[PDB]
Write a protein that holds these residues in place. Structure first.
Motif, PDB file in Angstrom:
ATOM      1  N   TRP A  85       0.866  -1.178   0.000  1.00  0.00           N
ATOM      2  CA  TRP A  85       0.000   0.000   0.000  1.00  0.00           C
ATOM      3  C   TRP A  85       0.906   1.232   0.000  1.00  0.00           C
ATOM      4  CZ3 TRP A  85      -5.095   1.392  -0.359  1.00  0.00           C
ATOM      5  CH2 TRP A  85      -5.410   2.686   0.101  1.00  0.00           C
ATOM      6  N   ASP A  86       0.886   2.036  -1.057  1.00  0.00           N
ATOM      7  CA  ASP A  86       1.863   3.110  -1.202  1.00  0.00           C
ATOM      8  C   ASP A  86       1.319   4.483  -0.842  1.00  0.00           C
ATOM      9  OD1 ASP A  86       0.377   3.984  -3.424  1.00  0.00           O
ATOM     10  OD2 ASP A  86       1.881   3.377  -4.916  1.00  0.00           O
ATOM     11  N   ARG A  87       0.079   4.556  -0.386  1.00  0.00           N
ATOM     12  CA  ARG A  87      -0.591   5.775   0.048  1.00  0.00           C
ATOM     13  C   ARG A  87      -0.499   5.979   1.551  1.00  0.00           C
ATOM     14  NH1 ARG A  87      -3.802   8.595  -3.545  1.00  0.00           N
ATOM     15  NH2 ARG A  87      -3.683   7.758  -5.724  1.00  0.00           N
ATOM     16  N   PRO A  88      -1.006   7.076   2.095  1.00  0.00           N
ATOM     17  CA  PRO A  88      -0.869   7.251   3.556  1.00  0.00           C
ATOM     18  C   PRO A  88      -1.422   6.115   4.395  1.00  0.00           C
ATOM     19  CG  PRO A  88      -1.438   9.303   2.571  1.00  0.00           C
ATOM     20  CD  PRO A  88      -1.617   8.281   1.485  1.00  0.00           C
ATOM     21  N   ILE A  89      -0.686   5.918   5.506  1.00  0.00           N
ATOM     22  CA  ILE A  89      -1.107   5.006   6.572  1.00  0.00           C
ATOM     23  C   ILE A  89      -1.107   5.757   7.890  1.00  0.00           C
ATOM     24  CG2 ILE A  89      -0.517   2.973   7.893  1.00  0.00           C
ATOM     25  CD1 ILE A  89       0.689   1.740   5.344  1.00  0.00           C
ATOM     26  N   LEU A  90      -2.209   5.662   8.623  1.00  0.00           N
ATOM     27  CA  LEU A  90      -2.312   6.133   9.992  1.00  0.00           C
ATOM     28  C   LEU A  90      -2.127   4.905  10.899  1.00  0.00           C
ATOM     29  CD1 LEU A  90      -4.784   8.687  11.527  1.00  0.00           C
ATOM     30  CD2 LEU A  90      -4.363   6.517  12.696  1.00  0.00           C
ATOM     31  N   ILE A 120       6.054   5.698  19.742  1.00  0.00           N
ATOM     32  CA  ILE A 120       6.414   6.564  18.631  1.00  0.00           C
ATOM     33  C   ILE A 120       7.541   5.945  17.808  1.00  0.00           C
ATOM     34  CG2 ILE A 120       7.491   8.757  18.044  1.00  0.00           C
ATOM     35  CD1 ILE A 120       4.413   8.777  19.030  1.00  0.00           C
ATOM     36  N   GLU A 121       8.502   5.313  18.449  1.00  0.00           N
ATOM     37  CA  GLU A 121       9.596   4.645  17.728  1.00  0.00           C
ATOM     38  C   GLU A 121       9.052   3.508  16.864  1.00  0.00           C
ATOM     39  OE1 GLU A 121      12.562   2.187  19.744  1.00  0.00           O
ATOM     40  OE2 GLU A 121      13.983   2.541  18.123  1.00  0.00           O
ATOM     41  N   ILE A 122       8.087   2.735  17.381  1.00  0.00           N
ATOM     42  CA  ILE A 122       7.528   1.625  16.615  1.00  0.00           C
ATOM     43  C   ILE A 122       6.816   2.170  15.375  1.00  0.00           C
ATOM     44  CG2 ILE A 122       5.588  -0.081  16.581  1.00  0.00           C
ATOM     45  CD1 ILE A 122       6.501  -0.690  19.567  1.00  0.00           C
ATOM     46  N   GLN A 123       6.046   3.233  15.541  1.00  0.00           N
ATOM     47  CA  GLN A 123       5.328   3.845  14.434  1.00  0.00           C
ATOM     48  C   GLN A 123       6.319   4.399  13.409  1.00  0.00           C
ATOM     49  OE1 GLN A 123       2.378   5.734  17.733  1.00  0.00           O
ATOM     50  NE2 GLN A 123       1.738   5.778  15.605  1.00  0.00           N
ATOM     51  N   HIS A 124       7.450   4.946  13.874  1.00  0.00           N
ATOM     52  CA  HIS A 124       8.530   5.323  12.964  1.00  0.00           C
ATOM     53  C   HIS A 124       9.086   4.148  12.176  1.00  0.00           C
ATOM     54  CE1 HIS A 124      12.035   7.177  11.276  1.00  0.00           C
ATOM     55  NE2 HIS A 124      12.824   6.314  11.909  1.00  0.00           N
ATOM     56  N   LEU A 125       9.373   3.055  12.859  1.00  0.00           N
ATOM     57  CA  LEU A 125       9.933   1.842  12.259  1.00  0.00           C
ATOM     58  C   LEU A 125       8.997   1.299  11.182  1.00  0.00           C
ATOM     59  CD1 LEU A 125      11.463   0.123  15.409  1.00  0.00           C
ATOM     60  CD2 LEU A 125      12.701   1.025  13.421  1.00  0.00           C
ATOM     61  N   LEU A 126       7.698   1.363  11.489  1.00  0.00           N
ATOM     62  CA  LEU A 126       6.677   1.003  10.507  1.00  0.00           C
ATOM     63  C   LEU A 126       6.643   1.960   9.323  1.00  0.00           C
ATOM     64  CD1 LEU A 126       3.698  -0.041  12.877  1.00  0.00           C
ATOM     65  CD2 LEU A 126       5.374  -1.489  11.690  1.00  0.00           C
ATOM     66  N   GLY A 127       7.076   3.198   9.517  1.00  0.00           N
ATOM     67  CA  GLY A 127       7.028   4.198   8.448  1.00  0.00           C
ATOM     68  C   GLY A 127       5.663   4.831   8.285  1.00  0.00           C
ATOM     69  N   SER A 128       4.947   4.932   9.397  1.00  0.00           N
ATOM     70  CA  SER A 128       3.666   5.585   9.475  1.00  0.00           C
ATOM     71  C   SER A 128       3.625   7.006   8.947  1.00  0.00           C
ATOM     72  CB  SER A 128       3.371   5.707  10.987  1.00  0.00           C
ATOM     73  OG  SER A 128       2.112   6.342  11.121  1.00  0.00           O
ATOM     74  N   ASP A 129       2.578   7.404   8.244  1.00  0.00           N
ATOM     75  CA  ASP A 129       2.430   8.782   7.814  1.00  0.00           C
ATOM     76  C   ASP A 129       1.736   9.662   8.858  1.00  0.00           C
ATOM     77  OD1 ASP A 129       1.921   6.850   5.220  1.00  0.00           O
ATOM     78  OD2 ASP A 129       3.337   8.527   4.840  1.00  0.00           O
ATOM     79  N   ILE A 130       0.727   9.109   9.514  1.00  0.00           N
ATOM     80  CA  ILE A 130       0.059   9.796  10.607  1.00  0.00           C
ATOM     81  C   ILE A 130       0.257   8.957  11.869  1.00  0.00           C
ATOM     82  CG2 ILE A 130      -2.012  10.750  11.618  1.00  0.00           C
ATOM     83  CD1 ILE A 130      -3.116  11.273   8.739  1.00  0.00           C
ATOM     84  N   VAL A 131       0.965   9.516  12.820  1.00  0.00           N
ATOM     85  CA  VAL A 131       1.366   8.899  14.088  1.00  0.00           C
ATOM     86  C   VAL A 131       0.384   9.361  15.143  1.00  0.00           C
ATOM     87  CG1 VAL A 131       3.314   8.744  15.728  1.00  0.00           C
ATOM     88  CG2 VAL A 131       3.789   8.887  13.296  1.00  0.00           C
ATOM     89  N   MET A 132      -0.311   8.556  15.908  1.00  0.00           N
ATOM     90  CA  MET A 132      -1.086   8.796  17.092  1.00  0.00           C
ATOM     91  C   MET A 132      -0.220   8.813  18.355  1.00  0.00           C
ATOM     92  SD  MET A 132      -3.756   9.295  15.467  1.00  0.00           S
ATOM     93  CE  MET A 132      -4.574   9.817  16.987  1.00  0.00           C
ATOM     94  N   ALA A 133      -0.417   9.851  19.160  1.00  0.00           N
ATOM     95  CA  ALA A 133       0.134   9.956  20.472  1.00  0.00           C
ATOM     96  C   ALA A 133      -0.277   8.692  21.250  1.00  0.00           C
ATOM     97  CB  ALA A 133      -0.353  11.198  21.203  1.00  0.00           C
TER      98      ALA A 133
END
Ligand SMILES: CCCCc1nc2c(=O)[nH][nH]c(=O)c2[nH]1
Ligand SMILES: CCCCc1nc2c(=O)[nH][nH]c(=O)c2[nH]1
Ligand SMILES: [Zn+2]
Ligand SMILES: [Zn+2]
Lengths: 362, 362
Positions: A85-90, A120-133
């Motif tokens: 999936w090459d579009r945004p991911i939340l 936040i680090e896990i969401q970074h590792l995943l390469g998330s576009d929209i990160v939830m607090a």
């Protein structure tokens, strides 16, 4: 495209329609996000998810950090490449599931550690576009004392989430960060929370804690005072909602973004959404019904197969039944969001909502 | 197009390549038929089955007559319309499954009645393009006395099947009828059977009873004398076979048509076919393998997803894992059949078979 740009093109009452521009694409608002729980929108190829009109999908952090693992997905090229999936991911923070599916402390949660910084680090590792607090989803119901203590911790966690995100150059330059309002059903706590969140500053603001047992009347009551508390010029995201009529009513109250597992999960269990309300395709009355799931739906499923065939598939436990029901349901949700956006753009959303409800509930 | 026309365009030894023309389309031979057990090729849309290169699919009569029912499918427009596959469908007679998944008599079989006449009527109701005679699949091993008694009944049933088919104008004008040779592993009984079948006259001839426990050596031994017994100018169909190497060896011995559940069933269980042999994608060694299932495969799955992702999907029990594995496996089988047809057309099939086996078994 910019890292993040939310533009409101048209309004009607509290309802808004517009776009979120991000590096990986444009999100049309109000937006419905199909949920991919373990790097897949269940029973759909990502091309099929897109074909239904989805601009963005949600990935659950909790499940990915457990299987296949965040470091592993990063090593493999990140979640977009992994799942195709090459579009945004939340991505959600993990905060909800770690409690529902523990040792809680001010540091985070230990379970069979997740904390703001790790989330936040896990969401970074995943390469998330929209990160939830990373937050705490307060159980419903909750006493005011407990909801206040919970909200306060979440707001301390929101600041920690903010700083963890900003401390990583590539994440801060390429992703967005959303804060999550708590406070249960209490106006004063919702205000405190909104205030705290705005002081920190986020790219968007979720309304948390309202998909956890409240009936619609109550959820709407809380939205009535809660959404106006959030910054007007940023997206408003109602986590975990909901039914088609939940979504219409929430847009009427100023929400811009939605997610929920109902269209996928329901679909696999035999519930199909129609403009005349949900139907349970396993019902014997559909055994020889040659009509499509829905008489107006433009999806590929309704173009090609009958209720009778899908009835057979679901009763037989066939994978293709899950696939067809899921595609239709996700397409229905997307057509609902398109109708909402168009009607706000044309200043006839209030009428649309009335008309929708008269027919959906008949 | 004619009701039925089998043309042989090229030969190499006992191997043949050609076409079967039918009203609903052309079948390239040697042909592999994906099996649709209950009006679905498991985990695939019919468009996806076609996309892999399949020209025809098999439907099981036993399962359809039980669910959703033959009369019901006919009322609904026939099997092609019901399931959304508009190309030829071959249906089996039901004869195999009624015994494996009873009261046997000369009339037919009663179970928790199926007979030649009922079987042919059910296949008509389904709207089958290629109708299989109702037979008895003799268990393996069988004593010569038992195999003879079984074969003899099947040949009486083959005549009844012939007459039942011819007695229905629309079926006789629009479908084809195949006979099935029995006789276990015994040359004299296989000859008797071929003789009986040819005397009745069919549009094609299956080799029955060889997918029921015989090892490859034995199956090949029986094919060696059995296929030359059949009319040369009609298709030869090996029911229920088989593995990629089974198929190559059977084409070497004069078979034109194949079916088996291995690519679908195997696929769902984590086995993927490659030119270097099958792999079990659940194996931990694939957890971070970024290569496609197969290095040469042209299918959509290999264009887009890694072994690592499919490994994750199958370990997680995700529907998309079943879908992706099944599509690849069916595409692999179709690419195998294409390579077989091209190599016979070019007079280098014997070399292809040698090369295929050296690599597949390395
Ligand atoms: C069963 C639906 C739950 C939706 C949800 N609410 C919340 C919330 O209130 N905070 N954080 C979250 O990840 C979250 N997810
Ligand atoms: C497990 C694979 C069985 C294949 C098969 N063999 C046979 C046979 O020998 N006769 N009739 C049939 O339908 C049939 N199907
Ligand atoms: Zn539809
Ligand atoms: Zn492939």
């Amino acid at each position: 495209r910019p890292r993040f740009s939310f533009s409101i093109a048209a309004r009607e009452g509290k309802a808004r329609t517009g776009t979120i521009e991000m590096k990986r694409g444009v999100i049309r608002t109000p937006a419905f996000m199909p949920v991919g729980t373990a790097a897949t929108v269940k029973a759909l190829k990502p091309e099929t998810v897109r074909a239904t009109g989805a601009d963005i999908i949600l990935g659950n952090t909790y499940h990915l950090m457990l299987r296949p693992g965040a470091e592993r997905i990063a090593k493999l090229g990140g979640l977009h490449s992994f799942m195709g999936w090459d579009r945004p991911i939340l991505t959600d923070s993990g905060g909800y599931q770690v409690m529902s599916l523990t040792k809680q402390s001010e540091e985070g949660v230990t379970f069979k550690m997740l904390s703001p910084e790790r989330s936040i680090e896990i969401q970074h590792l995943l390469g998330s576009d929209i990160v939830m607090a990373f937050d705490e989803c307060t159980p419903y119901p909750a006493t005011p004392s407990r909801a206040a203590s919970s909200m306060e911790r979440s707001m301390r966690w929101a600041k920690r989430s903010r700083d963890a995100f900003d401390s990583r150059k590539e994440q801060a330059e390429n992703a967005a960060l959303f804060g999550i309002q708590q406070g249960s059903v209490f106006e004063n706590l919702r205000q405190q929370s909104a205030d705290a969140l705005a002081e920190i500053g986020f790219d968007g603001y979720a309304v948390g804690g309202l998909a956890v047992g409240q009936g619609q009347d109550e959820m709407f009551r809380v939205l009535d005072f809660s959404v106006p508390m959030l910054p007007d010029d940023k997206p408003h995201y109602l986590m975990g909602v909901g039914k088609p009529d939940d979504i219409v009513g929430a847009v009427e109250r100023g929400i811009d973004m939605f997610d929920c597992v109902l269209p996928t999960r329901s679909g696999r269990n035999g519930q199909a959404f129609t403009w005349d309300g949900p139907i349970n395709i396993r019902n014997a009355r559909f055994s020889e019904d040659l009509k499509p799931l829905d008489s107006e739906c433009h999806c590929a499923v309704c173009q090609k197969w009958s209720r009778a065939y899908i009835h057979h598939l679901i009763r037989a436990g066939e994978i293709l039944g899950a696939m067809l029901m899921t595609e239709h349901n996700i397409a229905f949700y997307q057509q609902l969001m398109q109708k909402i956006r168009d009607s706000i753009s044309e200043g006839r959303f209030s009428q649309f909502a009335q008309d929708f409800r008269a027919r959906y509930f008949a």
